[PDB]
Enzyme design. Structure first.
Site, PDB file in Angstrom:
ATOM      1  CB  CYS A  94      -2.028  -0.914  -3.721  1.00 38.44           C
ATOM      2  SG  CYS A  94      -3.827  -1.149  -3.643  1.00 38.44           S
ATOM      3  CG  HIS A 105      -2.192  -0.784   0.954  1.00 35.89           C
ATOM      4  ND1 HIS A 105      -3.164  -0.369   0.056  1.00 35.89           N
ATOM      5  CD2 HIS A 105      -2.575  -1.959   1.502  1.00 35.89           C
ATOM      6  CE1 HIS A 105      -4.098  -1.304   0.085  1.00 35.89           C
ATOM      7  NE2 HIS A 105      -3.790  -2.278   0.945  1.00 35.89           N
TER       8      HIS A 105
END
Ligand code: LZU
Ligand code: LZU
EC number: 3.4.22.-
Lengths: 353, 353
Positions: A127, A78
C-alpha cells in the site's frame, strides 16, 4: 510436477503505530492460510510484526528453502519505493519512512535466487507506494461485514485451480483488469523465471518438518477452575493466526446465592501490548478476531492475544470472579494465577538472528 | 484487443571489432522480421550497429510509441550486467566492457513506462552476461547451413498463435525447459505489467505511418549500363535488412570478340567499411547474405552493403569491365560512375540526437 515439501509464510500488518492502519490484511491472511492449508502447505500466518520480527520470520522461512521444496511468501501491508527499490514496512517504523527500519524486497529476492527450490512464490500486496521464483507485486489496498483486498478477491477464486502458477497470476492480473478499480491503474506486476510446469496444486512424495509445524501450532487444553465460593469457571482457547489466540471465559456452575458473576482475565505479561480496555468483551468480534460468535460458545467473555511472538516467558495471567448478590451492597473479588505455557508460535522463541 | 498501429525495431549485432563475433543474430533478425511482417508490423531490421547508431535507433523507435500502438523491440547480441543493471553491447564498444559505451536496459524500460501503448514487447537475446510492457530477457547464445538461436528456435514456432503474449512467452520458456541446453540453465526471464488480453496477432483499425515505412524501404530500380566496346551490363538489387543491400552484376550482351569479361563493382564511399577482399564474389553466400543463390540470378558477381545507416551522401560507385580476348596478351579496363541515391534506411539520415 512434484514438491519435496510445501512451506509458506504469511505476513499481515494491520496496526501501525506511526502510519495509517490497514483493514484488508486480516482477512487476506486468514483466507489465504486455510486455502494453502487445503493445498497441503505447512503455513505460518503472522499479524502485526515489527522490524526485528519481520527480519527473523523471513530468515527462518528462507532456511526451509532446501532443494525441490515449494515456498510461498505473502506480505500484505504498507510498502515504500526508493531508488527503484521496494520495501516492506513493519508496524514499529517511524514516519517518514526510512530504509534502515524496512525490508528491501530486492535483497529477499537476491537470497531466494541462491536457492534450489522447485518453486518459490513471492507475493506482495503493498500500500501507498534455477530457483523458479514467481514474483507477484500488487499495488492496491482500496478493498460482508469484513474487508477482503482487491488482489485476494481474485487470487482466492483461482488459487485452487490445477494450472501453472504464472498462468493463474496472469489470469488474476486480467481479472483485476476487468474490475473497475484495478483496470484504471495497473496494480499487478509479474516477474517469472519458471522453466517448468510447476503449480500450487502439486503433490509431495523428510516428513519430519510436518511434525515441527504441529509442535509450532499446539493450542492449550480447555481448563476449568474451581473457586472457594463454589463457582466453577471454564477457560477455552481458539487459534486465529500463528501469533493470534482468542481466550474465552464461561461459567459452568453457579449456586442459587450468586445473582451476578463473570470471570475476567487480567495481568497478562508486559511484552504483549494488550490494553484491558479491549479485553473481556461481550462477543469475539469486539476485539476483533476474524473468528465469528458462531464458531465460539455464546455467554463468554473474549480476550485476543494479538502478539505471541513476544512471549519470552511461559504465559501467566490472573482470573477474577467479580460476584455480587443483591442481598449484600458491596461487590467482592477472588483471584488465581494460571500457566498456559508457550502457546502456538510462542513455543519457538522469535529470538534471535 | 485492437492496435492503433504496429511498429517494431529489430537490432542484431554479429560483427564485433573488440569482442567475440556472433552467428545467430542474422537468422533470428531475418526470420523474426518476416514473421512480424506477416503479423502486419511496420518493422525496421538493423544489423551491426555502433553505440551512437543504437542510441538513435531506440530513441526513433520510442517516438512511434504513441497511445494504443503496439511496439516490439528485439535485440540480439552481446550483453553486460553491472550492479543489477543490464546493457546492450554495440559493435564499437572496447574490451573490457564499460557502461558509457553501452545501452542501459533499465533506462529504455524507464522511458517505455512513460508511455500509453496498448502493448510493448521488450525482447533481449543477450550473450556472455499503463504501458503494458512485456519484458522477455533471454541469456543463451549457444545456437541447415545457417545458425538459428535457442530463443528464436522456439519463439518462431509460437509467434504466430492467437494467444496472449505473456502466455506464449511462458510457453516458449517451458519449451526451452524441455530442450537439453535450455533446461540446465534458466535463460528466459519474463516481466509483465499486462492487464488486458493483448496479442501480437491483433488487428489494426493514422495509416500515414505506413507510407513513411514504404519510403524508408525503397530499393533502387534495376539498371543497365552500355559500354564503348559494346558489352551491356545489368545492375540488380536485393534487400536483406533495413541497412543491408545486396548488389549484383550480370552480363546481358557479349560480342563474339570478347572471350572473358565480368563487371566488378568498386570505389564505394569511405563511410561504409566494405573491403574489396569480400566483394564481387561467385555466389551471394560468400559475403555472406542470408539470401541464397536461388532467390538471386546465377552467373552474377555479388557485393553486400552491410552498413547503410552510415550513408551521409548519395551512393556513388564505379563499375569496371576487365575484358580480355586470347588474341591479345594484355587485359584492358573501362569504368563508369553510378548514382543509386539514398537506398533503404539510408534515405533517412541516421544523424542525429
Ligand atoms: C514447519 S513449516 C513452516 C513454514 C513456514 C515457517 C515456519 C515453519 N517457521 C518455523 C521454522 C523452523 C523452526 C525451527 C528452526 C528452523 N526453522 C527454519 C517459522 C519460524 C519463525 C519465523 C518464521 C517462520 S516461517
Ligand atoms: C514507419 S514504421 C517504423 C518502425 C520502427 C522504426 C522506424 C519506423 N524508423 C523510422 C522512424 C521515423 C522516421 C521519421 C521521423 C520519426 N521516426 C520516429 C526508425 C528510424 C531510425 C531509427 C530507428 C527506427 S525504428
Amino acid at each position: 510436477m512434484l514438491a519435496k515439501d510445501k512451506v509458506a509464510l504469511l505476513i499481515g500488518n494491520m496496526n501501525y503505530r506511526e502510519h495509517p492502519k490497514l483493514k484488508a490484511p486480516l482477512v487476506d491472511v486468514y483466507e489465504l492460510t486455510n486455502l494453502l492449508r487445503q493445498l497441503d502447505f505447512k503455513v505460518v500466518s503472522l499479524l502485526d510484526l515489527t522490524e526485528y520480527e519481520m527480519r527473523n520470520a523471513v530468515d527462518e522461512f528462507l532456511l526451509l528453502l532446501d532443494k525441490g521444496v515449494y515456498g510461498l511468501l505473502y506480505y500484505a501491508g504498507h510498502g515504500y519505493e526508493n531508488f527503484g527499490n521496494s520495501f516492506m514496512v513493519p508496524v514499529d517504523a517511524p514516519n517518514p519512512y526510512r530504509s534502515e527500519n524496512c525490508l528491501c524486497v530486492q535483497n529477499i529476492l537476491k537470497l531466494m535466487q541462491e536457492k534450489e527450490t522447485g518453486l518459490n512464490v513471492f507475493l506482495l500486496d503493498m500500500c501507498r507506494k534455477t530457483a523458479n521464483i514467481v514474483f507477484g507485486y500488487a499495488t492496491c489496498q482500496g478493498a460482508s461485514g469484513l474487508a477482503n483486498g482487491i488482489f485476494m478477491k481474485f487470487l482466492k477464486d483461482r488459487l485452487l485451480e490445477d494450472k501453472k502458477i504464472t498462468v493463474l497470476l496472469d489470469e488474476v492480473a486480467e481479472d483485476m483488469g476487468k474490475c473497475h478499480l484495478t483496470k484504471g491503474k495497473q496494480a499487478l506486476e509479474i516477474r517469472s523465471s519458471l522453466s517448468e510446469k510447476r503449480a500450487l496444486t502439486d503433490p509431495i512424495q523428510s516428513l519430519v518438518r510436518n511434525l515441527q509445524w504441529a509442535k509450532a501450532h499446539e493450542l492449550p487444553e480447555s481448563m476449568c477452575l474451581k473457586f472457594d465460593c463454589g463457582v466453577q469457571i471454564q477457560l477455552g482457547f481458539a487459534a486465529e493466526f500463528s501469533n493470534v489466540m482468542i481466550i474465552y471465559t464461561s461459567i459452568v456452575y453457579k449456586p442459587p446465592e450468586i445473582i451476578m458473576c463473570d470471570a475476567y482475565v487480567t495481568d497478562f505479561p508486559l511484552d504483549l501490548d494488550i490494553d484491558p480496555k479491549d479485553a473481556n468483551k461481550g462477543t469475539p468480534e469486539e476485539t476483533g478476531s476474524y473468528l465469528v460468535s458462531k464458531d465460539l460458545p455464546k455467554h463468554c467473555l473474549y480476550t485476543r492475544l494479538s502478539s505471541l511472538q513476544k512471549l519470552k516467558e511461559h504465559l501467566v495471567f490472573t482470573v477474577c470472579l467479580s460476584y455480587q448478590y443483591s442481598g449484600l451492597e458491596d461487590t467482592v473479588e477472588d483471584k488465581q494465577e494460571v500457566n498456559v505455557g508457550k502457546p502456538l508460535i510462542a513455543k519457538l522463541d522469535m529470538h534471535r538472528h
